[PDB]
Tab-separated table of C-alpha atoms and ligand atoms in Angstrom:
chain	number	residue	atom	x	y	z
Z	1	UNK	CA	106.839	102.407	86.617
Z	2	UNK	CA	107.349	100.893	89.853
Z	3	UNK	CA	104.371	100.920	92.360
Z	4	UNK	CA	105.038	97.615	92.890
Z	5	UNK	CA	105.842	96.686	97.195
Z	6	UNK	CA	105.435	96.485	100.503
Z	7	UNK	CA	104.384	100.159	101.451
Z	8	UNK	CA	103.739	101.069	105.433
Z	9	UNK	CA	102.110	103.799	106.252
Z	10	UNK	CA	103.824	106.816	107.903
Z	11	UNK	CA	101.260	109.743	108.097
Z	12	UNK	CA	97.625	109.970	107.706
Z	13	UNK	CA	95.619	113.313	107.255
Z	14	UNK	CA	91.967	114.273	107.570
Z	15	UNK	CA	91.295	110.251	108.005
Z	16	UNK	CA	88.500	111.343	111.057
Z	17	UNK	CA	87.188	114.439	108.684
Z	18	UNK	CA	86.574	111.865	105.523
Z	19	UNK	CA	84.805	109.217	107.475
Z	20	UNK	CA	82.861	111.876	109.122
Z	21	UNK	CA	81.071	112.565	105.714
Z	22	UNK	CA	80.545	109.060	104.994
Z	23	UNK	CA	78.242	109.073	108.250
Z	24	UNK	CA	80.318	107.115	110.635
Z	25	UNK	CA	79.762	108.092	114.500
Z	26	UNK	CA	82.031	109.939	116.777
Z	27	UNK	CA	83.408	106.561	118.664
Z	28	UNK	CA	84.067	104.159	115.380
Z	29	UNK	CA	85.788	107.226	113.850
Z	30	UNK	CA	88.277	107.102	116.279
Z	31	UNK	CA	89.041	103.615	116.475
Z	32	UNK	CA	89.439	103.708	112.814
Z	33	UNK	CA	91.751	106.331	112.896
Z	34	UNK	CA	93.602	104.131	115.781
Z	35	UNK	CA	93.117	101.240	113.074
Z	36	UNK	CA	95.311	103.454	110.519
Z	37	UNK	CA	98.520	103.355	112.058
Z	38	UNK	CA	98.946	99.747	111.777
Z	39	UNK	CA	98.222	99.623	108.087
Z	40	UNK	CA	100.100	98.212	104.798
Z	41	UNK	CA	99.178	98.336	101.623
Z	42	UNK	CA	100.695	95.608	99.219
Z	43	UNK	CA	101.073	96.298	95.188
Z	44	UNK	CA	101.994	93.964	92.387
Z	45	UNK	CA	101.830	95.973	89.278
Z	46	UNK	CA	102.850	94.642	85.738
Z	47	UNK	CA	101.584	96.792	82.955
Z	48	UNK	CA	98.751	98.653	83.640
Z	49	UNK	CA	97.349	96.220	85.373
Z	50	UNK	CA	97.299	95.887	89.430
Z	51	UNK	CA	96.988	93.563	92.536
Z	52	UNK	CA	96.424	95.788	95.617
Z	53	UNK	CA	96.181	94.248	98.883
Z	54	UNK	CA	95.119	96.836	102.214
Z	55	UNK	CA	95.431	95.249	105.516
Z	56	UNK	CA	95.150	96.317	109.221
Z	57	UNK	CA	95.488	94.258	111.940
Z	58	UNK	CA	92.253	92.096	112.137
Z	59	UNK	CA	91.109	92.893	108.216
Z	60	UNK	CA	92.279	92.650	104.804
Z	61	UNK	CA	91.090	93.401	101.726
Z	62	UNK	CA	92.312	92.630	98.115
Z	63	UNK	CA	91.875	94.947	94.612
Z	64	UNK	CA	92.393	93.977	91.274
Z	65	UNK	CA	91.948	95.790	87.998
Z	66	UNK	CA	93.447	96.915	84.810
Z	67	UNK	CA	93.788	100.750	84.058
Z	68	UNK	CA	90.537	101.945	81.795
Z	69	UNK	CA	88.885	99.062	82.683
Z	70	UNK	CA	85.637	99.213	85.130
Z	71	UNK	CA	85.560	97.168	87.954
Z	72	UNK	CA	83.563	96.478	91.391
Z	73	UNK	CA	85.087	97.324	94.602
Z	74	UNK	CA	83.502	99.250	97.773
Z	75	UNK	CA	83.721	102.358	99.451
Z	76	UNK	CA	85.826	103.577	102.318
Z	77	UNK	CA	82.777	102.886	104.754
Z	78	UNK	CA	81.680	99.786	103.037
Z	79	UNK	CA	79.353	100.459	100.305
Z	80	UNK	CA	79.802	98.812	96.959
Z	81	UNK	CA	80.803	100.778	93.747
Z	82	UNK	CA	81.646	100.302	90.591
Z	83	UNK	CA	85.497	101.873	90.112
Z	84	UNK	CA	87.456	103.349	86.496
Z	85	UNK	CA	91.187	103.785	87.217
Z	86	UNK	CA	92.790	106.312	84.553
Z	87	UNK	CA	96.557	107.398	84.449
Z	88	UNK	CA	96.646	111.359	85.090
Z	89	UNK	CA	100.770	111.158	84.691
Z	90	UNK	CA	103.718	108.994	84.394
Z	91	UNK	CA	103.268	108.374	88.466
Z	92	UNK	CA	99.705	108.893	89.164
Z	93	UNK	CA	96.302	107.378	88.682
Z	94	UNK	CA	92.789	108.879	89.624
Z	95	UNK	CA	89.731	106.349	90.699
Z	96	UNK	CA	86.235	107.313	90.101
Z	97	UNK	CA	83.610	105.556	91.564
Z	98	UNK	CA	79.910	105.306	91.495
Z	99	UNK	CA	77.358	103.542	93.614
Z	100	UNK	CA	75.769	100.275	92.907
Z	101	UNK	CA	72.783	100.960	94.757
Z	102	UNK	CA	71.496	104.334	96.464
Z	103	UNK	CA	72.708	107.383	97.262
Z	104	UNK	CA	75.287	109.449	99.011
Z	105	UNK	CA	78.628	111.728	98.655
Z	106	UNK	CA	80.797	111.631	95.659
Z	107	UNK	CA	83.722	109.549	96.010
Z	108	UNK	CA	87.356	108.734	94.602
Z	109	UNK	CA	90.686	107.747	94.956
Z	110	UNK	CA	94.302	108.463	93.787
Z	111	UNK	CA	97.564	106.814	94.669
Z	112	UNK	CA	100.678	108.413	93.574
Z	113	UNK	CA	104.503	107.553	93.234
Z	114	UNK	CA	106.834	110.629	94.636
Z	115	UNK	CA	109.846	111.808	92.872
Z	116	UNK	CA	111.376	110.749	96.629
Z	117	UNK	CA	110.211	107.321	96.865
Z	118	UNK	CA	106.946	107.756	98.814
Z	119	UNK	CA	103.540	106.710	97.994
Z	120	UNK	CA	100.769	109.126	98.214
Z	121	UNK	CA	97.054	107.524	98.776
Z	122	UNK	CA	94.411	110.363	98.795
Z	123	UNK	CA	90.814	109.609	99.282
Z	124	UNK	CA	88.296	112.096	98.626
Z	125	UNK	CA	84.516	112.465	99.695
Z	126	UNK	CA	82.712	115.700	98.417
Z	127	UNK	CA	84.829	118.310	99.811
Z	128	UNK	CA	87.163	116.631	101.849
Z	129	UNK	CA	90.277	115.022	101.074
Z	130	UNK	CA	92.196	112.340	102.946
Z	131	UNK	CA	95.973	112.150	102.644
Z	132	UNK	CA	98.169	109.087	103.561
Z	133	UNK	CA	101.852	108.779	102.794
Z	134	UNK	CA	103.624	105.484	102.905
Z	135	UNK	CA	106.918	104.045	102.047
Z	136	UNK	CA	108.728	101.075	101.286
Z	137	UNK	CA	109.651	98.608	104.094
N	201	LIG	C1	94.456	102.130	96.072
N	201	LIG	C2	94.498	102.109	97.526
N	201	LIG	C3	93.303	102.146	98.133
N	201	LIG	C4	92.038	102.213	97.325
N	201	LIG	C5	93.214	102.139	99.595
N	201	LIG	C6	92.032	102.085	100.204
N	201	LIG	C7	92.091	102.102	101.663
N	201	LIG	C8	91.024	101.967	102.462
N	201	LIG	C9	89.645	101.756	101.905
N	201	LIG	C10	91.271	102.017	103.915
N	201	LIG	C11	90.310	101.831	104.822
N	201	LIG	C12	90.485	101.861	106.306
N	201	LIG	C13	89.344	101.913	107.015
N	201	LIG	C14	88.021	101.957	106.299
N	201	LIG	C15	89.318	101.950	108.523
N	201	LIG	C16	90.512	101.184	109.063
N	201	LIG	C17	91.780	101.804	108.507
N	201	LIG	C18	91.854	101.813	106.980
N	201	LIG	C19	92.698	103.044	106.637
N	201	LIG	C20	92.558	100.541	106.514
């Protein structure tokens, strides 16, 4: 399918909550969460494999990785991890990741293609899950 484009981001829920978990302070949360509304993510998808580039204003960040295939990336708040895409449906893939060194909450990540022509980003951390819907621009 077609997760391939330009997506902009048009609502963001439990952002604060999630980065709350991963032991960020009251003050950086909210300048992240400030961060969040000026934030695109770019996709170039051909196969099952993917080019995934997140930006905000004065960062970017590229991914790259082929579905079933481990590869290294980092956490929401920074900390490296080794990531496993796998397709739960048509539209939807589930990341697990794990740690390369130390300890700390369980994380993942899904991105999802709606029926409607949105993408859905959730990021998860123990118990709390992070919602962000974006669409085309
Ligand atoms: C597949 C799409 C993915 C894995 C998107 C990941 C997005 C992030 C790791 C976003 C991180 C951000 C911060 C850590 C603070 C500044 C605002 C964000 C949302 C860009």
């Amino acid at each position: 399918p077609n997760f391939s484009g330009n997506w902009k981001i048009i609502r963001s829920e439990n952002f604060e909550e999630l980065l709350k978990v991963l032991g960020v302070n009251v003050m950086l949360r909210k300048i992240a969460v400030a961060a969040a509304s000026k934030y695109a993510v770019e996709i170039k998808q051909e196969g099952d494999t993917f080019y995934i580039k997140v930006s905000t204003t004065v960062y970017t960040t590229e991914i790259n990785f082929k579905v079933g295939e481990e590869f290294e990336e980092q956490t929401v708040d920074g900390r490296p991890c080794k990531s496993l895409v796998k397709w739960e449906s048509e539209n939807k893939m589930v990341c697990e990741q794990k740690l390369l060194k130390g300890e700390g909450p369980k994380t993942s990540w899904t991105k999802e293609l709606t029926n409607d022509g949105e993408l859905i980003l959730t990021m998860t951390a123990d118990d709390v899950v992070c919602t962000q819907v974006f669409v085309r621009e």
